[PDB]
C-alpha cells in the first residue's frame, strides 16, 4: 500500500535552490532506501541520488538527497541551478511486498530567458479540405517564454466550447516554446459564422488572430 507523492511542478531562476519533496503514504519512508532519477525529454532516466543521500560518480554536489523521518518524506535539493537541470525528477523506493514504488514525478523548469510574447498565426480551412466535407482551423503558437499559455477559441466573438484540440507546449530549437491548437468543424458550421478567433493568453497578456470565411 506504500505510495510516494511529489509536487507536480517546480521552478526557479538559474543559480538558486529548489527542493522536491517525496512524501510517503501508507508506509514508512525510512524503511527502504530512496532513489532519485533525472529523466529528460526523449531520454531514459538516469540516477542522481541513490540510497537516500549517495551521489553517483560525476553527479555534482548541487544534487543532495535527504530523509525527513518526522514528516515521512524525502527531498532532492538542487542548488546553483543551471538551465541544463531542466528535467523530470522521480523518487522511488520499495514497499513491504517486494514491489517497486515510483513517485509521480516533478517537472523542474529553469527560467533563464526574458519573457517573450507568443507569435500567433491562424489558418482557415483549405478549399481541398472543404471539398472533402471537413473544416479544420489551425492556430500556431511560437516563440513564447516561459511555456505556459492558455488557448481560447471564439466563433462570432462567442467562446467555442467543443471541437478544440491543443498541444502541450514544447521547447523549440531556440529554447522558446511552441504549441498548436485545432478547431475542427463541419463545412456547415464553418460557413455559418462570420469570424473565428484564436486567443492566446501568456502571462496575463493576450495575442489573438481573426479569420473570416470568404
Amino acid at each position: 500500500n506504500f505510495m510516494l507523492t511529489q509536487p507536480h511542478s517546480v521552478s526557479e531562476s538559474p543559480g538558486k535552490t529548489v527542493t522536491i519533496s517525496c512524501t510517503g503514504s501508507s508506509g514508512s519512508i525510512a524503511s527502504n532506501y530512496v532513489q532519485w532519477y533525472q529523466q529528460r525529454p526523449g531520454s531514459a532516466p538516469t540516477t542522481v541520488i541513490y540510497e537516500d543521500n549517495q551521489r553517483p560518480s560525476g553527479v555534482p554536489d548541487r544534487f543532495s538527497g535527504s530523509i525527513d523521518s518526522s514528516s515521512n518524506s524525502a527531498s532532492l535539493t538542487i542548488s546553483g541551478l543551471k538551465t541544463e537541470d531542466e528535467a523530470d525528477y522521480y523518487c522511488q523506493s520499495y514497499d513491504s511486498s517486494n514491489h517497486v514504488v515510483f513517485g509521480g514525478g516533478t517537472k523542474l523548469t529553469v527560467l533563464g530567458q526574458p519573457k517573450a510574447a507568443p507569435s500567433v498565426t491562424l489558418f482557415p480551412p483549405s478549399s481541398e479540405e472543404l471539398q472533402a466535407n471537413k473544416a479544420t482551423l489551425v492556430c500556431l503558437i511560437s516563440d513564447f517564454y516561459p511555456g505556459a499559455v492558455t488557448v481560447a477559441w471564439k466563433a462570432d466573438s462567442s467562446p467555442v466550447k467543443a471541437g478544440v484540440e491543443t498541444t502541450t507546449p514544447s521547447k523549440q530549437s531556440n529554447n522558446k516554446y511552441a504549441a498548436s491548437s485545432y478547431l475542427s468543424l463541419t463545412p456547415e458550421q464553418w460557413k455559418s459564422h462570420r469570424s473565428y478567433s484564436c486567443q492566446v493568453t501568456h502571462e496575463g497578456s493576450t495575442v489573438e488572430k481573426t479569420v473570416a470565411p470568404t
Binding site: 532519477y37 531514459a44 540516477t47 541513490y50 517497486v100 515510483f102 471537413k134 489551425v138 498548436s180
Partner: protein, 210 residues
C-alpha cells in the same frame, strides 16, 4: 559498455497480445535482478515487473497480474515480457532496466520500446495546404500511428514543424509552416514533403495562395 536493447513493441487492438524481448550485453546477465518499467506518453514512470537473477521469483504490479508474464534466459542474455489481454491503459514506452541489487538503484536502462494499444487502425493522413513576409504551411491530419516527417526542400526564411496533437478521435494531427517574403508567393512554388511510413503514405503538395 552495458547495453539493454528492447524490441518487439508495436500496435495492438484492445485485448490482443504482445511479447517484448530485451537483449543484454556487457555484463554477467545471470547475476542481476531485472525489471520492466513503463511510461505512458507524457506521464510518470510506473514499475511493471521484476525477476530474480535466476528466475526463481517474480513480482508484478497489481494492474498487470494475471495478464503479464516476465521471464528470462540467462544463457541467451534475454529478458521477456509476455502481455495478454492488453488494454489501452498499458500504452507506454516499456523500459528494460537492471537494478544494482534487490533494493538498489535502477542503474542501467534501455532506450525503450513503444507499445500502443488502441482501437484505432493504421490510417494514412490527409494533407491540406495552409494557404496564406507571409506564412504558409501544410496540415497533416488524422493519421495513425506516429511519426511523420515534413520537408520543404523553394528556399524559406525559416521553417517550423509543430509536434503532433492526439485528437479526441484517437488519431493524431500535425502542422508545419515556413516563412517567406510576402511577394514571393505568386512567384516561387512552395512544396511540402509529407511522409507517413507506417501507412506507406508519401504526399507532395504545392501550397498556393487562394
Amino acid at each position: 559498455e552495458v547495453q539493454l536493447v528492447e524490441s518487439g513493441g508495436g500496435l495492438v487492438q484492445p485485448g490482443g497480445s504482445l511479447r517484448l524481448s530485451c537483449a543484454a550485453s556487457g555484463f554477467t546477465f545471470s547475476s542481476y535482478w531485472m525489471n520492466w518499467v513503463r511510461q505512458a506518453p507524457g506521464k510518470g514512470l510506473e514499475w511493471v515487473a521484476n525477476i530474480k537473477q535466476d528466475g526463481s521469483e517474480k513480482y508484478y504490479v497489481d494492474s498487470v497480474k494475471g495478464r503479464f508474464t516476465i521471464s528470462r534466459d540467462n544463457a541467451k542474455n534475454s529478458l521477456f515480457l509476455q502481455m495478454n489481454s492488453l488494454r489501452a491503459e498499458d500504452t507506454a514506452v516499456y523500459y528494460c532496466a537492471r537494478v544494482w541489487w534487490l533494493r538498489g538503484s535502477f542503474d542501467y536502462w534501455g532506450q525503450g520500446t513503444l507499445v500502443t494499444v488502441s482501437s484505432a487502425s493504421t490510417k494514412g493522413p490527409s494533407v491540406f495546404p495552409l494557404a496564406p513576409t507571409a506564412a504558409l504551411g501544410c496540415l497533416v491530419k488524422d493519421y495513425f500511428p506516429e511519426p511523420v516527417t515534413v520537408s520543404w526542400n523553394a528556399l524559406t526564411s525559416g521553417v517550423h514543424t509543430f509536434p503532433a496533437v492526439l485528437q479526441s478521435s484517437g488519431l493524431y494531427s500535425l502542422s508545419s509552416v515556413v516563412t517567406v517574403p510576402s511577394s514571393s508567393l505568386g512567384t516561387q512554388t512552395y512544396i511540402c514533403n509529407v511522409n507517413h511510413k507506417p501507412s506507406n503514405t508519401k504526399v507532395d503538395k504545392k501550397v498556393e495562395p487562394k
